[PDB]
């Protein structure tokens, strides 16, 4: 099945500026991005630790 850890970060339609983490497969590390507040995809984490635990090594 498709690895959700490899999907580009998704900001969504809502207009909040919430800082979340996504696994950047190209760089091999969890990076920060702007989440709008709704319709979050799975490559969206509240902390670097959650991101590494879920997507580390993807």
């Amino acid at each position: 099945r498709p690895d959700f850890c490899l999907e580009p970060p998704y900001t969504g339609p809502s207009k909040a500026r919430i800082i979340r983490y996504f696994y950047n497969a190209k760089a091999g590390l969890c990076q920060t991005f702007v989440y709008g507040g709704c319709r979050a995809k799975r490559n969206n984490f509240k902390s670097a630790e959650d991101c590494m635990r879920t997507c580390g090594g993807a």
Partner: protein, 223 residues
């Protein structure tokens, strides 16, 4: 705010910033102890920042007050964004003067074409990223329900309304959510969502505050 202008220090006294280690949403002060924002702006450890202009620097007119309560509308739907409204109680009453003041709730809904003031510390670019230090403002008209539904087929509920310019270039954006849309001195909208920011044929969507006046008054009074 994309395509707007610098409001001027404390020219929008009811505008507040919701901070959780950084600015993430806006809000509107409706009385010394209550703020109206968006339901999708619910977040842990909210601190309401009043009297702000430059959100990155202490200028001397700020009041930082923690949220003691955050009541999301009971019918809020996180999938459709219907009923995107939240009431935040301040742990301690804010000191109102000219720089920190409440905005009146509407007595009736605003008609299409009514010019309003939209404000916030959100992204100022339609393509790319640029967050301002000071508060940005934008004059924009309420749009018809028909044009709003045409722009967003099957997404507009009776609790949402569009505002802006169809040609693009002027709109609210990420970081503006929860903020005000004031028309003739009344809070008619809450920055909610849209397809990107300032895109042609994609005006901003806002929570219709005029549909919640009774709920707002009763909820505040019972908390």
């Amino acid at each position: 705010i994309v395509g707007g202008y610098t409001c001027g220090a404390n020219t929008v006294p009811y505008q507040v910033s919701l901070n959780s280690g950084y600015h993430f949403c806006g809000g509107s002060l409706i009385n010394s102890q209550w703020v109206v924002s968006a339901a999708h702006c619910y977040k842990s450890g909210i601190q309401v920042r009043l009297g702000e202009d430059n959100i990155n620097v202490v200028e001397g007119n700020e009041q930082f007050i923690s949220a003691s309560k955050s009541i999301v509308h009971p019918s809020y739907n996180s999938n459709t964004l219907n009923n995107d409204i939240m009431l935040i109680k301040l742990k301690s009453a804010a000191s109102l003067x000219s720089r920190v003041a409440s905005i009146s709730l509407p007595t009736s809904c605003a008609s299409a074409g009514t010019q309003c003031l939209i404000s916030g510390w959100g992204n100022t670019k339609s393509s790319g990223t640029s967050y301002p230090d000071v508060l940005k403002c934008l004059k924009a008209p309420i749009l018809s329900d028909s044009s709003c539904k045409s722009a967003y087929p099957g997404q507009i509920t009776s609790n949402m309304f569009c505002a802006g310019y169809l040609e693009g270039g002027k709109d609210s954006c990420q970081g503006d959510s929860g903020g005000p849309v004031v028309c003739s001195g009344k809070l008619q909208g809450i920055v909610s969502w849209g397809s990107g920011c300032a895109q042609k044929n994609k005006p901003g969507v806002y929570t219709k505050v005029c549909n919640y006046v009774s709920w707002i008054k009763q909820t505040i009074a019972s908390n």
